[PDB]
Structure 1
């Protein structure tokens, strides 16, 4: 449990990288590529039905990739079908949300969506202004932690692999996986000098 834990970090990070939808360098570069008023207006003039379809498609894709990420964690495939589903039900949306913070630009308060960056107003046709502001505020406050890629990988791993979830058959097995991931997270934070973030999550 020294080279074993160092392989778990390498593994979690690789599983994350190969199941992240977008490469970070493209997300950062594309910050300058902002939707015009004309384009934003095009999205706002879409019917409530059309927009919900579009946005539901993207969410579904995002969740699929989170499933692929979960399957890639050591031990996740060894859980009974009930537990796999429970952990994904309790964890997926939180992982999508943390993953989305990468696509959020706190400087101008925009997100990457369908190839360009735009603000909350993009989603006006959905009729969820309050919900969308709360999603943006979450991203905003999470972006102030300046999470590295490797940190997202390890942290989203711990979000999914949570033994406290209601409905779980094998609490003890999940506890072991969780514990190994906790060791992995805290180890990588020690070597990178980033222990300070533990207090503020």
Structure 2
């Protein structure tokens, strides 16, 4: 016993918020491009234009997802912004990792655009490509479903340990039921895999590491593009 209708409602609210701001790989009509498909180059300007537009669109969806999380809009507008700026890269990574097709070694974006590893390199990832693909491959054995990805994204976002929070205690209190919800959900879905909940939480460390490497890549990439990065990407990286 000790089940809670409030905790069940939180699981569904978070899963739906994620699913409604992020299509599943199976619901997308994949399409390709022949742009710099067979050889790595410093930067393909055509691919960067399409990729950075897809990144802007996903940052907007991440903000929509956040505003749907119970209690998020109850935090001060400064803390809402602080939390989004701090976790957006972590969430973009979790999201693109669910869009990895190992057989074809491709990533699929929300309009269905499917890029191979060389194309992901040429679109802007550059020296970060292989690490991102390695991260996606190591997330695959966890076999997380949409609810679990949604809950883990909400846990990364609602984090009281981010710098410059006005009400970190309030953020910590809001994160507590998200952790309870993920543990309850994960254990009930796969009771024969009790290590799944701590494996998901331990992934946050490598997710932060790959986000730090993302920020490092934005520095060098800036020197390669002809103009400034899209404004919402700049909001994320400041």
Segments of 5+ residues of structure 1 without an aligned counterpart are: none
- Cα deviation 1:85-114 (Å, max 9, x = unaligned): 111011111111111112101233211246
TM-score normalised per structure 2: 0.73
After the TM superposition, list the runs of 4 or more consecutive aligned residues in structure 1 that deviate by more than 4 angstroms: 42-45
Aligned with 1:118: secondary structure?
strand
Distance 1:24 1:169, change over 3 A: same
Distance 1:160 1:43, change over 3 A: farther
1:23 corresponds in structure 2 to 24
2:81 corresponds in structure 1 to 85
2:159–2:172 CA contact under 8 A, matched in 1: yes
Following superposition, the deviation at residue 53 of structure 1 comes to: 2.3
Aligned-pair Cα RMSD in Å: 2.6
**Matched residue count:** 194
1:163 corresponds in structure 2 to 160
Following superposition, the deviation at residue 124 of structure 1 comes to: 4.5
1:9 corresponds in structure 2 to 11
Distance 1:123 1:101, change over 3 A: closer
Following superposition, the deviation at residue 43 of structure 1 comes to: 9.4
Segments of 5+ residues of structure 2 without an aligned counterpart are: 204-238
Q: Provide the C-alpha distance between the structure 1 equivalents of 2:92 and 2:47, rounded to a whole number of angstroms.
A: 19
Q: Does 1:74 align with 2:76?
A: no
Following superposition, the deviation at residue 183 of structure 1 comes to: 1.1
Distance 1:25 1:128, change over 3 A: closer
Q: Provide the C-alpha distance between the structure 1 equivalents of 2:16 and 2:125, rounded to a whole number of angstroms.
A: 35
Distance 1:40 1:143, change over 3 A: farther
Distance 1:199 1:107, change over 3 A: farther
Q: Provide the C-alpha distance between the structure 2 equivalents of 1:185 and 1:101, rounded to a whole number of angstroms.
A: 19
2:197 corresponds in structure 1 to 198
- Cα deviation 1:152-195 (Å, max 9, x = unaligned): 01111101011111110001111111001111111112321253
Distance 1:124 1:106, change over 3 A: closer
1:43–1:125 CA contact under 8 A, matched in 2: no
Following superposition, the deviation at residue 128 of structure 1 comes to: 4.2
Following superposition, the deviation at residue 49 of structure 1 comes to: 3.5
